[PDB]
Structure 1
Amino acid sequence: RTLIVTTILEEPYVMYRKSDKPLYGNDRFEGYCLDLLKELSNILGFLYDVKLVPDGKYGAQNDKGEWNGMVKELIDHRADLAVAPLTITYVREKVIDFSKPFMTLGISILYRKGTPIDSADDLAKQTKIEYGAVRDGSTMTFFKKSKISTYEKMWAFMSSRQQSALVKNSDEGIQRVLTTDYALLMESTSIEYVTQRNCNLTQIGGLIDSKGYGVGTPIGSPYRDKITIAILQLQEEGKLHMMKEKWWRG
C-alpha cells in the first residue's frame, strides 16, 4: 500500500517547485524533507504520496484539549507519517509516536546585526526591544510552560496585550525583525537558514531547550522504529549532514 505522508510548506524543508507548467503529485515539491523521504523510502522500500496538511497547521491543543494539524491527522489515522520540521515535545509525544530526531535544534534568537543584545537575559530585563514567537508553535509553548525565572518573565511580556508580540508564522516574524525593533524567538535551524540569506540578521546567544525534529507516526505504528533505524543509518553514513548542507548553504 502507498503510504500517506502529511507535511506542510516551510522553507527549506518543503517548498513548491517552480515550473513553467502545472505540477502533479510528489513532483510538486522539493526540499530537505523530500530528500529525506526519498532516502527513507530507498532504505525501507515503501511508496508514498506527499499531501499538505489540510488545515495548514503543525499540531497544538485548544482550550478543550482538542488537537489540530499534522498531529491530529496522525491521531485520526488520516496519514501514515508526518515528515516536516515537527518538533519533538512532551505534549505531542503523548499522543503520537515520534521516530528519533533526524535534525537537532534549539530555541535561539533571530535579531539584526550590530546590536549589543547578547542573550535571552538581555531581552528579558528590558521592555524597549519587543520579542516573541510563532503563536502556538512549540517555541511559544516552551515559554508558556516554563517555571524558570527568566523564561516566565519573557512569557509574561510575550503574552501581554493579547499576545501582540507573537506572529502567525515564521515568514511574518522575519519581516517584523527586518523592519522594526523586534527579536524573534526561533528554532536554531531556521535561524541558520535565514541568516545565510539575510546578511543583516544574526543569531543572538546560544541554544536553549535543545530538541529535534522527528518523523511523526500514529501510536502503535510499525513504521516508527524502522524509520528510526533508517535515520541512524543515514546519520552514521554522513548523509543527513550532507542533506542539510545542500538546502542550508546560501
Structure 2
Amino acid sequence: RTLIVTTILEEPYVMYRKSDKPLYGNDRFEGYCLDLLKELSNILGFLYDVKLVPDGKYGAQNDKGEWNGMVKELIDHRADLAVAPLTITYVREKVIDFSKPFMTLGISILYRKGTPIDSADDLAKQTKIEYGAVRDGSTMTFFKKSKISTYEKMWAFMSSRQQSALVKNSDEGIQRVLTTDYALLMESTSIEYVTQRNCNLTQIGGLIDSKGYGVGTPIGSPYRDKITIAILQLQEEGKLHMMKEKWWRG
C-alpha cells in the first residue's frame, strides 16, 4: 500500500533536517521535493516511504548500457516514484516514464550589476570579459558537447589556458564570483538561489538551453498521467511558485 519513493540529497530539493536526536523515517528529510511529494500525496491519495538512492546517483549508463542511480531503482521496480530534480532526457525517457516537468530551467549567466553585458552573445563576441562553468557538470558538458557554433566558440575559450576558467563545484564557483572578477555559467535555478543571497549578483539574459525536472516512474506506471495532471494543478494554483519561494528565499 505504501509507495517507495527514491530521491537524492541535493540542496534545496532534498536535505537532512537539523536535529540532535537521530531520526528514522520521512521526518529525516525536508526540502522542495519533500513538499512536492506531500502535495502530490494529498491530491492523488497515497502513503509513501522516502528512500535515498543507495549509490547517490541520478542515473546514467555504463559502457555496457547498464543503468545506475534512481533510474535503475525504477527500472528494477525497487521504487515506485522518483521525486527529485531528475532531468528529463532522451536516453532516460526510453527506459522510464516521466511526468511533465514540475520545474523548468536552463543555463544562464551569473554576473554583476552595472555592466553593458546583457547576453551570452555579448560574450562570444569579445575577449576582455572572461567566463567559465563548474568543472565536469551539466553546464560544462553542454558547452563541451555542443555543435552550435556560438557555444563551441565559448567552449574553446572556457577550456583554453589549461581550463583555468572552470571550477571544482558550485560552492567554489560562487566564492570565485564573490572574490574575483568571474562569471559562472550555470543552471538558472542555482543562479536564482545565489542571487537571493547576494544582492550585487544578478542573472544576465535568459536561458541558453532548456530542460525540465520530472517525476520518474517505471514504464507503464499508472501514476505517470496522474502525477502530470497533479503538477499542472499545483502550477495553475500557484503552489509550485510558493514552494519554490519557500526553499529559494533569501
| TM over 0.5, shorter chain | yes
Question: Quick check: 50-59 or 39-48, which moved more?
Answer: 50-59
- Deviation readout 1:122-143 (Å, 9 max, x if unpaired): 3334566554444554434433
Question: Quick check: 36-45 or 65-74, which moved more?
Answer: 65-74
Question: Quick one: distance in 1 between partners of 2:93 and 2:44?
Answer: 23
CA change 1:174–1:96 in 2 (3 A) is farther
When normalised by structure 1's length, the TM-score is 0.85
- Deviation readout 1:7-36 (Å, 9 max, x if unpaired): 222222112211232222111111111110
Q: Does the 8 A contact of 1:12 with 1:32 survive in 2?
A: yes
Question: Quick one: distance in 2 between partners of 1:66 and 1:137?
Answer: 21
- Deviation readout 1:148-194 (Å, 9 max, x if unpaired): 11111223344557766554543333233323443222221221111
Question: Quick check: 79-88 or 123-132, which moved more?
Answer: 123-132
Match in the other structure for 2:72: 72
Question: Quick one: distance in 2 between partners of 1:136 and 1:60?
Answer: 14
CA change 1:53–1:112 in 2 (3 A) is farther
Listed as ranges, the matches of 1:228-247 within 5 Å are 228-247=228-247
The structure having more radius of gyration, on CA atoms, is 2
SS in 2 for 1:51: strand
CA change 1:58–1:169 in 2 (3 A) is farther
Q: Tell me the CA shift for residue 219 of structure 1.
A: 2.1
Q: Tell me the CA shift for residue 215 of structure 1.
A: 0.7
SS in 1 for 2:106: strand
CA change 1:239–1:113 in 2 (3 A) is same
Question: Quick one: distance in 2 between partners of 1:132 and 1:93?
Answer: 30
Gaps of 5+ in 1: none
Q: Does the 8 A contact of 1:58 with 1:86 survive in 2?
A: yes
Question: Quick one: distance in 2 between partners of 1:33 and 1:154?
Answer: 34
CA change 1:169–1:42 in 2 (3 A) is farther
Which is strand-richer, 1 or 2?
A: 1
Question: Quick one: distance in 1 between partners of 2:86 and 2:40?
Answer: 17
Q: Tell me the CA shift for residue 101 of structure 1.
A: 0.8
Q: Does the 8 A contact of 1:60 with 1:136 survive in 2?
A: no
Q: Tell me the CA shift for residue 42 of structure 1.
A: 0.9
CA change 1:82–1:227 in 2 (3 A) is same
Listed as ranges, the matches of 1:112-131 within 5 Å are 112-126=112-126, 131=131
- The percent identity for this pair of structures is 100
Question: Quick check: 189-198 or 69-78, which moved more?
Answer: 69-78
When normalised by structure 2's length, the TM-score is 0.85
Listed as ranges, the matches of 1:182-201 within 5 Å are 182-201=182-201
RMSD: 2.6
SS in 1 for 2:231: helix
Question: Quick check: 76-85 or 33-42, which moved more?
Answer: 76-85
Number of equivalences: 250
- Deviation readout 1:97-141 (Å, 9 max, x if unpaired): 110011222211223444553322233345665544445544344
Gaps of 5+ in 2: none
Q: Tell me the CA shift for residue 60 of structure 1.
A: 3.4
Q: Tell me the CA shift for residue 228 of structure 1.
A: 0.8
SS in 2 for 1:226: helix
CA change 1:142–1:89 in 2 (3 A) is farther
SS in 1 for 2:64: coil
Q: Tell me the CA shift for residue 96 of structure 1.
A: 2.1
Q: Does the 8 A contact of 1:97 with 1:217 survive in 2?
A: yes
Question: Quick one: distance in 1 between partners of 2:227 and 2:166?
Answer: 34
SS in 1 for 2:134: coil
- Deviation readout 1:55-77 (Å, 9 max, x if unpaired): 22323345555443323332333
Q: Does the 8 A contact of 1:113 with 1:200 survive in 2?
A: yes
SS in 2 for 1:206: coil
